[PDB]
Amino acid sequence: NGMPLNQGAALGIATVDAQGRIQIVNQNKPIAANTISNISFKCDVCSDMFPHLALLNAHKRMHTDGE
Ligand SMILES: [Zn+2]
């Protein structure tokens, strides 16, 4: 939980030499999650797209579910 420190980057080169501040402890950063990274949920059935997953997900229920 929580947001990573801003004004920086995940991949690249750091300005820390022999001496400096201790950077965050990282094991393995997972990829492929709901972080709204310029992703829009669009409905292929009727072209219904919304800024929310619930909106689209709920919408699709009408298109398909128990038919
Ligand atoms: Zn739709």
Question: What does the alpha-carbon distance between residue 40 and residue 52 come to, in Å, rounded to a whole number?
Answer: 8
Tokens found for residue 57: 């997900």
**Signed CA dihedral, 30, 36, 40, 43: sign only:** positive
Residue 49 half-sphere exposure, CB side, CA atoms within 13 Å? 6
CA of 51 to the centre of ligand 1 (A): 14
Structure tokens given for 2: 């929580």
Strands (E), 1-67: 41-43, 48-50
> How far, in Å, CA of 13 to CA of 30, rounded?
21
Distance in Å, CA 32 to ligand 1 centroid: 24
How remote is the C-alpha of 60 from its chain's centroid?
A: 22
The C-alpha atoms of residue 6 and residue 2 are separated, in whole angstroms, by 12
Sequence spans of domains, the chain = 36-67
| Cβ 41 vs Cβ 52: under 8 Å | yes
**DSSP state letter for 20:** -
Way it was determined: NMR
Binding region for Zn(2+) = 43, 46, 59, 63
- Using an 8 Å Cβ cutoff, are 56 and 49 in contact? yes
